[PDB]
Structures are given as structure tokens and as C-alpha cells.
Amino acid sequence: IFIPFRRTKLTFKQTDHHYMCNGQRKIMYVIWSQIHNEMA
Amino acid sequence: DIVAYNLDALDVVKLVHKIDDTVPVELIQECLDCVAVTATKDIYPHQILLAQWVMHKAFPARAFSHINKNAVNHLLAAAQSLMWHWGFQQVAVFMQVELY
Amino acid sequence: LKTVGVNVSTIWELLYEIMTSLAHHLYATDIDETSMYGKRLTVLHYLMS
Amino acid sequence: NLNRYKARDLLNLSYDDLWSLPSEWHLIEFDDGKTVVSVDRITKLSVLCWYPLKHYKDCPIPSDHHIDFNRILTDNPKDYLNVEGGRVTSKAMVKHLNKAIWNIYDWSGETVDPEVLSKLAIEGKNWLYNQTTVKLSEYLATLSMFDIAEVYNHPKVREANHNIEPTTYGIEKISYGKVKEVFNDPTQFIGNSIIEGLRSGTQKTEQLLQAFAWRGFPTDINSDIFKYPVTTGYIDGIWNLYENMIESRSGTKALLYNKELLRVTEYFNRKSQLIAQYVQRLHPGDCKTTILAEYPVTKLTLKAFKGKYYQKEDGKLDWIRGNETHLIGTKQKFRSVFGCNHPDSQGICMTCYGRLGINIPKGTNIGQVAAVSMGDKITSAVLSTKHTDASSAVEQYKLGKIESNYLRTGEIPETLYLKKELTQKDYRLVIARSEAENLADILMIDDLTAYPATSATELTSLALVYDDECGDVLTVSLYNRRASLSIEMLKHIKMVRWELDQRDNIVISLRGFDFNLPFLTLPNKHVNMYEVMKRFQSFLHTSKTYLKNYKSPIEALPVFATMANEKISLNISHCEILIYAMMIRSAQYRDYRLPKPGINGQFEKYNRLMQCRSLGGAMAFEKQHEPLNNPGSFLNKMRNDHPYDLLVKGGKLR
Amino acid sequence: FGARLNATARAVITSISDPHDYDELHIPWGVGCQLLKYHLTNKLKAKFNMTTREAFSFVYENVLQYNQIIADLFKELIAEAAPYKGMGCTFHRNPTLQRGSTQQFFITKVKDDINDNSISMSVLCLKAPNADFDGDQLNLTLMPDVYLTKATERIAPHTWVLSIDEPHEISGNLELQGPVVETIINWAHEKYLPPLEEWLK
Amino acid sequence: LLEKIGEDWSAAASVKTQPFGLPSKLNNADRASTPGRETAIRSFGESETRSYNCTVGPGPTAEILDQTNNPLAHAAVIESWLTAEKPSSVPVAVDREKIPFGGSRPVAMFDHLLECSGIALEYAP
Amino acid sequence: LKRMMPTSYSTAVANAGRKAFFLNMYGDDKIYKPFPDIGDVIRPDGVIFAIRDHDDDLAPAEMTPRALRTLDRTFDRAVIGTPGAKVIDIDIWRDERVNPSPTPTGMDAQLVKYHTHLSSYYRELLKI
DNA sequence: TTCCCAAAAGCCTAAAG
RNA sequence: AGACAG
Ligand SMILES: [Zn+2]
């Protein structure tokens, strides 16, 4: 999901991740967005 | 163009007759014989200026700043012959000259 | 965002909408990148960048 | 009571006398014992093709030089009264020029320079062109609405353009078959410019088929086939919106596959030419070498051996021709480039190379010839992928011996299946996370009905594992065709979920999965010749088929030969030259010059060969600072010579 | 490895559909005048009492205009190229893929039409490159020597006759063009005579 | 009618040279000053010099590139054109004895630049 | 092809100041004309401007009336258009606040003419 | 911009004084 | 490095 602002040109991406509920493994999407440009 | 102007200025009889058809060939021969000795020394700005003035109907003036030394000497001989035939003998004397 | 159909007033509201309502566009999107309807023909925002 | 003429006497006639012959049926008598019944115009064309024979008055003219050589005069009139004559094509006239020049070559003791023969061939073609352009100023060809109507109004074409099931089988094998049968009939259309040109190769059949018959399944920018075909051809108007848009996308595909595929292909061609330019000299003669290469001749690769010497029985050398049925599928001892102990360091003999070396000009770089031939063929194939796209029959995916032990095919044109033997043990699928990024979406969607299976995953390798912990990895993708998990297994994964692994690979238990259901649905996508070119590049420069992995070039040539001949018809001599350019002698001792006789030596990668063979050849390739700043380049080691050396310096020989 | 040759021209390839020679090229008036600048200067100086400056002035003045003198000079240059059809030269089509992309030709005549900025390469030598008359400009390098002409003789068109990928076959690049093949078809494959049985009877 | 009508033909017997001797491109004022363009066409690229080096011996190709690169060789070619009774069919264009190989400007620049680094490419003995 | 003749409009720009001066290519000995007038026709050899570098020491060589008319292809700067092409118009820009005028007296007739017309036009615009 | 592919970094595992 | 021509 690509959203432009006056300053930034942000992008919202997603990946998968695992977590245990009631002892059983479950998979959910984690939505991330790099915002600190110096991170790259 | 510079190579062509070198090969052009290597001849004098044709250019002299292009300036003036009525020029004896004996003067041309004498000037060439004098070039055969004068080519050793250096060429000075007044000589080049006079040769550029006299010979522009057949040879471009600015080419004098690009052509080689032998071509300049032959053009000086042709200009001296033209001056000698015309009657300006004093200036003709100052064509093939050494500094001192 | 109000024109599109989102009610953002603060960037945290935007993050909540993306995490809850706009996340539908991340895995199975009703609209498509291939189309060109519902798009603007902007001139000034790029000239006066 | 036909007329009579003699081949040699008729050839000696002047052009004015030759064209001033009556319209007749005449018996042409050749220097052999066969006589040909022919009409005057075919005879005149035959003589204009025979033109190279004028300069050699002592070479007999066999009966097969004539264009209409099908008819032969015999005692029984049953064999020549009604026989179809040889079609006159540009290819046919070139073939007759070829026959004449090689008759000249073979009649002598092969002591004729082939350059002279090629000179005579172009001279004959030029005289033919001039005489045809001058004399045939009224026998022109004309096109208008009348010809298109004449082809269009044929009742069988009209039937072949109606009542058609919109499928690949029902269009591109039935209706196109009917239209081909109509066109190929030698009696239906006579005097029609379009079909007269079609019967002689002037027009390729594919365009006329797409015009008169239904246009078939255009392609999008990505090489996928639309489900719904085009009902209308080009003679009738494609007036709908869907069909116009999809053919427009075909045109867009043409533009892009031109531009960017040229961008990559020319770079690969440059690298191949740079590397092949090391193999320089082809010296005519024979090296009398005893080393032979045991090559397996197969059906597909037989045409690639068209010029090469090999040992027959009783130790005799014969060269493969275009037609050998007995040798098909058998191992023969060819005389290859490898194992040629020619004195030259970069030179090979004529016999070891092949018959093709005769066509090679005298002072030519043979490695460049091989590289240029490959570049032409691959560039043409990559650009004209659209030419082969006229048929919507997607290239089927083949299963290897290891893959067939786990996967089967049937009950569906595209999708694969799991064999019942996998029920014996609790097998388990392992896939990469890189190739499965949008998979978890199936968990969030509560109805996997409208969800496309192709967007979930794009697989190229699957590890089937069972507990002991053994199992095997299988390659499922065919170049551009990346296999995707079927809807049934997407539902199973949604029901069962998965788990990661230390190797960061998704692991799925296949226990409880309903078998005999679709598995690894294959996309309806054409294989790209661009991917095949990438495969060629990777070959030349869990088990893959890189060239360096092979021990000896003898067992390495057939793999490359088959791989190339799958899509480009490349001679075996060119493949041998390229592989021999790839070779290296004593790679341990850091010696990079070409091995002699050609087998005693390993293989090497492209970059090391380019940057460690000759610095002059390394300057024209990438990263000049790497060999400039290299200790080995300063060592006084024997090295090969490259033409750029003379260009690296100003021209000083020594 | 090569950059920006001198004595080089580049022009749209429009050809001659006339009885000609395959090793025959027709450079036009402007290309002939500028490319053969010093040849024309030499001829003017040798024949007429003209200074080299006058020679350049005449040549440049008569590039966009026609005259009989410079045409005669072109004809005499091509004639004085004695053991050749004309002035040897190399002709390039880009991209250089095959042997036939670069081929030797011999200049035979500057065209008298000033409006023809065209280059009459032979019809036969068209298929060796991918040269079609759809508005493509090809390159032309004038060989300044007989030694270079003899060297280029190895790039002459007769070198690509024999196919480099077939043992005994002429390359498909020598096949006749469309119109000529169709003319030959319409001439030879016509029912202008009765069948053989009816012809005998 | 279309554009690309011609009129862009660029025939040039001899092209003006940079101070570092090599033909250059034409600037606007100096490109609109000649009847028809006077550009030095790059008819010898990497692919063209490949084809020449392979079809013909590298000798003649190096000679052509030396005539183009070395200004003295080009001057000798023009002098041979002008100082011949037959400007066509000149026996030898550049007398290599008078003008030896190795004077081409790019190659001399490359060799000098390497020598400034302490290295020089030379033939194996 | 006569029915299909494209019309081509082109612009030729020449600068002459202290660096160089216009030659005489459209006028006789009596009248000095550097470039064609409006509605005039370019020479059979399409040549305009032909400006020559200004050198005082070469005055009796490259400033004689014959030398001004004569064009040396080398050492001179001409702009070469299509011959026979009718001139549509001319735009003149002049820096009039240089006390020593670089152009010698005599070779500034058409220049001053067109500059005066353009100055009147722009002055009337400014007055409006 | 994104895919190719080689070369250097870096890491666990293993052999000799 | 963008467009155009092949
Ligand atoms: Zn051998």
C-alpha cells in the first residue's frame, strides 16, 4: 500500500509470522513499513 | 585542408601567374635558388605579413599560420618575385632576410 | 483519504485503518493495479514539486 | 514427337538465343543415360541456374540439375505423361545453383577453390536476376480484392471458418488443417497470386492462416494465453473489443520482446564471440590422428552432424549426410575437433572439424564463425518467438526419471499428480520461502473459490522427504513455466497450515491429504526463447548441467548439442568449436591456453579464461583493472594469441 | 577498438532495380562531392589551372548544385580505378551480426539528381544484412588504398554465398526477393500449353 | 509523407580534430556550417572491429584504425590522395616505413597511463 | 511527388561582434549585403553570413572588396541552408552601448535597417 | 530497476604439535 | 539519459 505525503513516499508491506495460541501454532500477517531512510 | 595548402604552397610558378600572368620565369628561378640557401634560417613576422598581403588572390592568408616552414619559404619567394616585377624593389629586398 | 473512503484525522488513525480496514488491499485486493479508473490527472502537484 | 535438346549444347547458347525458344515440350538429354521431359520456361530457368557450368566445359551435367527432374523419359509412357513438375522457388533456384557448383567441385579432384565457386554462384544469381527483370516485364504479379475474394469464396474455407469449438484442438488442428488441405491442393487455385506465392514459399502459411481462418489465442505482455480465442481472422474484421485488445497486447509483446531481449542477447553474443575468437585457424588437410570421439547419434541430433567424418567398418572414413537411417540412435566414432593433434596451437585440421570447413572462407576465424552462427540463430529465435506463437499449443512439461518416481501426469492437460506409492510412507513437502511469499493469504481468505492458485506460489523445486530422514528434491519448473500449487492443495494447506525449518524452508505435512486430486497446476504460459538463451549462457559460461561439471568434452558435447538443437538448428562443428574454446589445459598449473590434441584438458569458467588467457583479449571485456592488477599476468607463462593484441598496441607486430 | 573514422558517409539506402552488378554501388551527388573532396581537388588542380583554394571553393559551392565538370571528374575517377568496377568501399548495416552485415562494394556513379540522397546497393546483397528500404541509414567507408581494397576483398559478398551452418548448401541470404520470385512464378507456373498427353495427341 | 526524409547524410573526407587528436562530434554552430552534415561516422564499433579482425587479418584492421586515430597517418592518406596522378587506386596510402605503427593517440594514451602505474603490456618472448 | 512537397522552415543564427564581421555575399561592389532581404532568394550555393575573423594586420589581404565577396571554405564561418529558399523574416539584436563599434564602417547597412524597424516596433509596443 | 554471477567475508568443523 | 529512426 503506497501512500505519498508532502515529505515522505511511504510504502506499507507485509510478511508472515508465527505465534502459539492455546498450544497450537498459528500464522498471521505482520504489516511493516520502513520510515527511517538511513536504515538502508 | 592544411595538407592541401602545404602541397599547394610547394609550387610557386602557378601561384605567381595566378596573381599576375605577366611575370618572367627567370625571377621565379632566382627566388627559388635563393630559397634553397635561405631555408636554413628563421622566418620573421614582417616577411610573413608581406607574403600574406601580396598573395591572397591565390593562397589564403591565415594558412600561413598553419603551413610548414618550406611552404612559407616558397611563398616568400613567390611574394618577392611579385614585388620585384611590380616595381616595389625595396620591400622585395626585405623578403628573404636573416636577423642580425 | 476522505475522498477515497477513509476517515483519517491523525496518522495513528491512518495506521489503525491500514492495520484493520485497508489491510484487505494487501492480500486480496478488490481493486486492481492494472486498471485506470478512479484516478486523478494531476498537473500542478508535479509542476510545482 | 517432342522436341530434342542437349544440355551442354543448350547451355552454350546465348541469352538472346536461349530466350528465343518456342513454347514446346522437349526432351533434354544429359551427359548421363537419362532424359527429362520439360517445358521451355522451366528449361530456361534451369539453364540460368546452370550458368556456373559455363566456365567448365568438361564437367558432365547430371539429370538432377534440371528443375523438372521428376519426369524421366522411359519406355513405358505410364511414368511421365502425368507427373507434377518441380516447384520454382527462390530456395529451389538456390538449390540448383548449389547443385551446379558442387558438381563442379566434385567432378575435379576437389582442386577448385570454393571461393571461386561462390563467386560463380553470385554471378549466376545476378545473371538470372537481370534476365528475369528484362525479359519478364509483362509476367508480373498483381493483388487486389479479387484474389482475396477468390480465396475467401471457396466453399471449403467457408466451412472451415464456421461451426468451430473455441479450443486449441478445435481451432489450430481441425480448422487450420482444413485450410491447409485447401491451400495444399495443386488443383483448386490456379492463376491466383496469393496461393501461387504460398505454394512457392513467398508467403509463410501462418499469416494466411491467421487471415483467412480464425486468429488463434493472442498473448499478453507476459507470455500467457487468453482462455477465449479470436473468432475472426484478418480477411474479415476483428470488430469486437476483447479480441482487438488482446491482439493489441500481442503487438505490445512484440515490441518489448524486440527491445529488451535484444538488449540481453547482444551482450551474450558479444561474450560468446570474444571467447570463441581465441580459436583461430582452420588448416585444410588431415592430421592423421587416431583419437576418436564416441558420439551418440539420435533422431533430433542427426541433422546437426551434416558435416563430420567418422569411421565405418574396415576402418574407412565417411562423412555424415542429411539422410542416414541406420546410424540413428547409435554411438559412432566421429572425428571431432577434440583429439586433433594439429601442429598449430590454435589451429585445427579440416578432417577433424568437418565438411563444413569447405564452406568456410580461406583466411577466416573459425571460432568467430561458430559464435556468429549461434548468435544469428539465437537472436532470430528470441526475436521471432512471436513467429512460433502462432500456435497456442503450449510446450508440454516433461518429467525426468527422478521426478517420475514421485510425480505422474494424466486426467488433465496441465496439472500433475502424486502417485499411489507415496501412500506407502508419510511423505512431506518442503518448499522455499522465497518462492512462496503470498501463500499465507489462503489462511485469511475463508473461501478458496475465486482465489487464483497461480498468485499463491510460483515453485521451481520441491523436496519430498520421509522419515528414516531421507528423500529427494525435484525440479518442476520448465524455464518460464513456474509450477503453482493447485487449489486442492491450497485448501489442504489452509486446513493443516505449515511450519518453518532451520534452513528457513516451509515444511508441509501431506498426511490426510485427499490424493488423486490436482497437484502443481502448470500455467498456460509459453516457454520463452529468452530463458533458453539464458540456459545456453549458463551452460557455456539437486543437480544442474553446467559445462564445467563434465570430465571430458566427449561426454559433454552431446548434452549441449541436444540442448541447442531443441530450438535452434546448430551444426555439431560449431558446438565443438565453442566447447573447445571453453576448454583449458592443466588448470592446476594456472595454464590457460587451449589443450592439445583437445581432450587432455579440463573446462573453465568464462571470466577466468577471459582474464587469464591473454591480456589483449581481456581489455575488450569487462573489468580491465582486474587482470591489470593481477600477479599472474606478470608471470612469463606461455599464452595464446588474440587479435585484439594487435589492436591493444598501435599495430606493432613485435 | 575503433572510433569515428574519416572518409566516411552515412545515408538512407535507396537502390537500383535495374540490370546491374552485385558489386556495384551508386553514391549520390552530395555524398560524392564531400566524400571525394580531395580526389576532386586533385583532378581540378591537375586539369585546370586552379589553385587549391579555388578547388575547395568550387567543390563546396557545387555540393548543393549540379554541374557537368564535377560529374565528369567523378566519371574519370571511377574509370581510372582501372582493375575494379569503381572505387572500393565498405558498407555497414547496424547491428553487425553476420558476415554480410559488413560487405565490400565498388562505387560506380554519383547520381546526377541533387534530390537523391540515396545509395544504390545491389538487390542481391540486401538479405546478407537485415536491410530493408523502410527508411534505414547505412554506413559507407571509402577505402583509401589498393592494399586495403585487396584486404577487404575477403569481406566481399561472394564470401557469404556458402552457408556457414550447412556443409554443402548456399546460404539462404542469396534467395531472390519477393517481386522477382512472384514474377518468375507467374511466368513459369502458367497453363500456356496443354498437358503432355494432349500435346502429343 | 513522413519525417526522416533524408537530408541528414553525413559525408566527410576529413573531419576537424580535437586538441587530443581524435575526431569529435559536431556542435550546433559548427554542424550548421557545411552543405550536408560532416560527421565522422563510427562505422568501426566493437562489433564491426570484431568482424574485421576475424574475417580479415588484424593487420589491415589495425591499419585502418591507425589511419583514423593517428592524425599523422590521416595526413599521409590525404597527401597520397592529393599527390598522385590517379587519386583512385593509390598503390600504398601510408608508407609504414616513414610512419611506423604505434602512433595512434588512444593506444599511446593507454600505454603511457599504464607506464605511469608501473606496468606495460608487451609481447611474450 | 510534385503534389507531395513538404514545406520546411529553418532558422540560421549568426553572431558578429569584436570576434568576426560579416562578409559580402548578396551585394555587388557598390552595395554591401551580408544576408538576403525579406522575400529574397538564397544563392544557388546556399550560403549566408560567412563571417570572417577580424584581424587588422591582415587588412590589405582579407578586407579588399574582392576578398569580402570571395568565400574561403576554410577559415571562414558560413551558415549553409537550402539553396533557392525564400527568406521569411530576419530578427536583429544589437548591443548599441559599445563606444568603439567592432564592425568597421560600411558593412552595417541592412543590420541597422532591420534593427531600426524592430526598434520602432518594440518602442511602439512599450509606448502602448 | 531488477536479475546474473563471480569474488571476498564469514562461519562451524576438523587435524597436528 | 530521455525521445525518435533502423
Ligand atoms: Zn585433426
Where does B39-68 have alpha helices with state H? 45-54
Distance D336 CA to ligand 1 centre (A): 7
Count the Cβ atoms, other than its own, within 10 Å of residue D510. 20
**Chain-centre distance of CA B37, in angstroms?**
14
**Cα dist from D419 to D403, D465, D484, D496, whole Å:** 11, 15, 18, 21
* CB-based burial label for D511 (10 Å; 0-12, 13-18, 19+): exposed
List bases in chain I with any atom under 7 Å of a protein Cβ.
4-6
Whether E64 sits inside 8 A of G73 (CB atoms) is no
Indicate the length of chain C as a whole number.
49
* CB-based burial label for G83 (10 Å; 0-12, 13-18, 19+): middle
Q: How many CB pairs under 8 A join A and C?
A: 18
Nearest CA in chain D to E98: D372
Q: Which nucleotide is nearest to E134 (CA to C1')?
A: I6
DSSP state of D102: H
Residue in D588, D618, D617 with CA at minimum distance from that of residue D602: D588
**CA D130 to C1' H2, whole Å:** 54
CA distance D594 to B61: 62
> Look-up: residue for cell 600505454?
F111
Count the Cβ atoms, other than its own, within 10 Å of residue D464. 20
- Whether the ω angle into residue G65 lies within 30 degrees of 0, i.e. cis, is no
Using an 8 Å CB-CB cutoff, list residues of chain A that contact chain D: 16, 18, 25-27, 29
C-alpha cell at D461: 523445486
Q: Phi, psi (5° rounding) for residue F116?
A: -70, -20
Q: For D35-73, what is the HEC assignment?
A: EEEEEHHHHHHHHHHHHHHHHCCCCCCCCCCCCCCCCCC
Whether A1 sits inside 8 A of C27 (CB atoms) is no
Q: Which chains touch C (3 or more CB pairs under 8 A)?
A: A, D
Residue in B21, B3, B11, B9 with CA at minimum distance from that of residue B61: B9
Q: Provide the chain E residues 48-77 that lie in CB contact (below 8 A) with chain G.
A: 53, 56-57, 60-65
C-alpha cell at B62: 591565415
**CA D633 to C1' H9, whole Å:** 25
Distance D289 CA to ligand 1 centre (A): 6
CA distance D648 to F62: 9
**Cα dist from D594 to D299, D342, D584, G128, whole Å:** 32, 12, 6, 87
Whether residue G71 contacts residue G43, with contact meaning beta carbons closer than 8 Å, is answered with no
CA distance G23 to G34: 6
> Look-up: residue for cell 570447413?
D357
D504: contact with A, CB 8 A cutoff: no
DSSP state of D12: T
Of residues C14, C22, C27, nearest to A29 (C-beta): C27
CA distance F92 to F95: 7
CA distance D441 to chain C (A): 6
CA distance D365 to chain F (A): 5
Contacts of A37 (CB under 8 A, 6+ apart): none
Amino acid at F94: V
G45: contact with F, CB 8 A cutoff: yes
Of residues G73, G80, G82, nearest to E56 (C-beta): G73
What torsion, rounded to 10 degrees, do the Cα atoms D640, D646, D650, E2 define?
Answer: -120
Distance D587 CA to ligand 1 centre (A): 23
- Whether the ω angle into residue D597 lies within 30 degrees of 0, i.e. cis, is yes
Distance D352 CA to ligand 1 centre (A): 4
Strands in D510-587 per DSSP E: 583-584
Count the Cβ atoms, other than its own, within 10 Å of residue E2. 22
Of residues E159, E180, E199, nearest to D133 (C-beta): E180
CA distance D481 to D222: 11
Whether residue D356 contacts residue E166, with contact meaning beta carbons closer than 8 Å, is answered with yes
- Whether the ω angle into residue E95 lies within 30 degrees of 0, i.e. cis, is yes
DSSP state of D1: -
Helix, strand or coil for residue E188? Answer: helix
CA distance D645 to D649: 6
CA distance D348 to D360: 13
CA distance A1 to chain C (A): 7
**CA D428 to C1' I4, whole Å:** 57
Indicate the length of chain B as a whole number.
100
E138 beta partners? E11
Helix (H) or strand (E) holding E103: strand E102-107
Q: Which nucleotide is nearest to D606 (CA to C1')?
A: H6
Nearest CA in chain E to G46: E64
Instruction: Determine how β-strand G20-21 pairs with β-strand D602-603.
Output: unpaired
Residue in D348, D280, D274 with CA at minimum distance from that of residue D616: D274
Whether residue D383 contacts residue D399, with contact meaning beta carbons closer than 8 Å, is answered with no
Of residues E38, E45, E51, nearest to B58 (C-beta): E51
Experimental method: cryo-EM
Where does D432-528 have alpha helices with state H? 441-444, 453-456, 487-496
**Cα dist from F31 to D339, D570, G13, whole Å:** 59, 47, 12
In this complex, the residue with its CA at the shortest distance from the C1' of nucleotide H5 is: D538
CA distance F72 to F93: 12
